Amino acid sequence: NYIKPTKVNKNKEGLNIDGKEVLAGSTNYYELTWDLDQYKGDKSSKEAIQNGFYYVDDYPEEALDVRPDLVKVADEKGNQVSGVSVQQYDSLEAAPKKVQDLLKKANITVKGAFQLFSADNPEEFYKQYVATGTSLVITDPMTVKSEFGKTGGKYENKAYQIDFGNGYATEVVVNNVPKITPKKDVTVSLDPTSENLDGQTVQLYQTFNYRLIGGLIPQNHSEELEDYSFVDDYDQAGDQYTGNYKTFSSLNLTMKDGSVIKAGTDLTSQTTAETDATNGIVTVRFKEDFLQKISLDSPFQAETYLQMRRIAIGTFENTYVNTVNKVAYASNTVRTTT
Ligand SMILES: [Ca+2]
Ligand SMILES: [Ca+2]
Ligand SMILES: [Ca+2]
Fold first, then answer.
1. Of the bound ligands, which one is closest to the alpha carbon of residue 161?
2. How far is the CA of 60 from the centre of ligand 2 (A)?
């Protein structure tokens, strides 16, 4: 249009995920196009060519880590391009004046850190790709920061093609990271009204439940759920896991086939459990076969009740960790007294 660099975000499987929720620990497989086709067979002065050929990616450094060894420049046929290098700069102030002047002349402003891809030899780059109208594709994967997941928050990525010193902007690609915040309660039964005893008392030998509410995965998320587990390393000095637990959906779940599993539905059989009575730990994992059936357009959240017994006098704490695609999120810590 006619010189129209583009930027899209993709997941690992190559699905377009522009504007989608992206879980902490996920990778953004950004694809940048270097739009050269309109240049084919044109002639340009040596002087113009000497202004060089660059591609800037003003990536959101506060949120993402570049995965340097996944960054590739290819032509569209997939062939590796040599003669283009890339340099990350933590700021513009810290970049060569050559770079600062280049950007100023293209009227491009960047925020904090960015990447500059460079044609090492503008003459050979010209002859080989520009004159021949051979557009390129830059794969620039960048991974969400795990901590970001405690907070959530928007990030955006922006890019610029710079030919002959003229600058051309891609669209801005926006994503959001969900805040995942698991909760833990203490209850005597599964009744939905049952009293939270967090901060209260439990009798010796009383049977009770630790209720572990998982983090909420929002609709419109960017990739398959592979892992959603509840790991409860409880205090074996005061608590004994009786070997009974149940798992329930917390929301209506929409499957890929279009069916709906309603909120509160017993899904215990779509989970497995590891126990360890010695170190007092239990882990409940959804089966990956089940998780694979959830539509990317569905929210997801579950909760597990662990049947416990109080077996000593004293004050005992409990906290659980919800793992979501292998990132760990800790619940609040509950406390009861016997
Ligand atoms: Ca074009
Ligand atoms: Ca930046
Ligand atoms: Ca333990």
1. 1
2. 4
